[PDB]
Amino acid sequence: GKECDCSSPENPCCDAATCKLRPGAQCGEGLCCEQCKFSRAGKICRIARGDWNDDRCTGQSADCPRYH
């Protein structure tokens, strides 16, 4: 059970007591969080080096994950 959508308690987007988005904001902190909203998928959230696939937001994700 996750009750903290954010790690910073001083964040206004996510309630401090419930560490979660209080309003209709999608995310309080993240690379795909534009205006506390989910940016769009296919977003180069991270650029890899070498010869693989860069990191692209999934549209419904806020924290850009990794692959290699």
Curated annotation (Swiss-Prot):
Motif (Cell attachment site): 49-51
Paired cysteines (S-S): C4-C19, C6-C14, C13-C36, C27-C33, C32-C57, C45-C64
Residue stretches making up the Disintegrin domain: 1-68
Highest rank taxon of the organism: Eukaryota
Role description: Inhibits platelet aggregation induced by ADP, thrombin, platelet-activating factor and collagen. Acts by inhibiting fibrinogen interaction with platelet receptors alpha-IIb/beta-3 (ITGA2B/ITGB3).
Name of the protein this chain belongs to: Disintegrin rhodostomin
Naturally occurring in which organism (per UniProt): Calloselasma rhodostoma
